[PDB]
Predict the structure.
Amino acid sequence: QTTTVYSLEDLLPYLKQDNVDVKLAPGTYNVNGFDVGEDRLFSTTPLFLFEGSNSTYDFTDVKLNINTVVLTKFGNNEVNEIQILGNNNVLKNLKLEDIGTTAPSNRAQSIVIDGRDNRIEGFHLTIRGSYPYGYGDAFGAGGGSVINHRKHSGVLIRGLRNHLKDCTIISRSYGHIVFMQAASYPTVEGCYIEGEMRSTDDMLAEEGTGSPADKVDFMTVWGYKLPAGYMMSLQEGGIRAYNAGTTYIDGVEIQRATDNPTVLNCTIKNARTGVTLAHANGTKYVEGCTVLGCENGYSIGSGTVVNCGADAIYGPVFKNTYGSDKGYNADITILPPSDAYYNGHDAVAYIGGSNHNLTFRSEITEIPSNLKIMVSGDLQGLRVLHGSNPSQNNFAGTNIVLRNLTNFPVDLHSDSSNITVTSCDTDNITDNGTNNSIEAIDC
């Protein structure tokens, strides 16, 4: 009792219905500007609004191309390609691609998951169309921007017990790739998440062209001219949780923080951060992940990161978010470089807050001269130089267990205290803190 349909026009009615089992015939389906409007197939945004419950949709060998001009076809309103509002739905195997480079009139999300107990599996997403594209967040990702933005993010997970599984999410757009707002018990599992990078030196080479960055003389939102020597993502977070948001379950509007997020066996590459769950409440659990060439590896604030790896070519594998972080437990492998080193942060980890149990493993024997494990101190972080974002730099660290099973050096700043350090070698450890103990071990 599986119904097969052969066009987007024949598909749309089933999106309103409960308990359906629908298949969209293999093929390549184009949505264009001429397809959006009053008499046209799509008169409202979101384009594909899944309102029914207990339904399954098969998109095997479906290619769905959406021209980015569609993001300008609904006025000054947010545009979403896919939004799920019902419960207990399963969508599988869709290949979806944004065509062109037109930015939203307002902003856009490819996929938004409200409701409860939904699952998207096997999707292959390619996200395009945003402004500005090519600077990451250097000229603004929020209010008071130097260059006003019209962002386009990938998958927004909200709702309750919603599940993103075995998907591939490629972003070539300024926005988060996967993020969570007001999501309770979200799970991201088995996914490949990929952005692209650009050095600040390359951006600075736009001088004299009349580019948007040139017209503001490269003055960042952080308060200083864009510094040379860093690698940025052109995207925002790889997997990022927010401590607020709006979601809709059973028609009821809800405003709440993300809580109890789980991330399992994902690979994140070339994003501003691999996994950042520090703003979520509840239990944060990250296991089996691989983060390559991100500006920041893991920042969950408090919780567990276990059996995870990250390389350190563009930024630290580990960072505490604020000086108030408490109970971050982590076992992170520093992986072999996935590309040439270009790390202006001068750190493999920045540690502060209290009551952390931290283990770093690595087989690296060629240690770049600028890379070290920092407990407290003045991080040379791209966004925290010269007193900017001061709550995210220069904080104290106390009552922390640090197992340095690597050849990287450790610098314990004067603001650190009661740090118990276990290291392969103790000769490359600087201790300027109070009541810290340094004990060597074999291997």
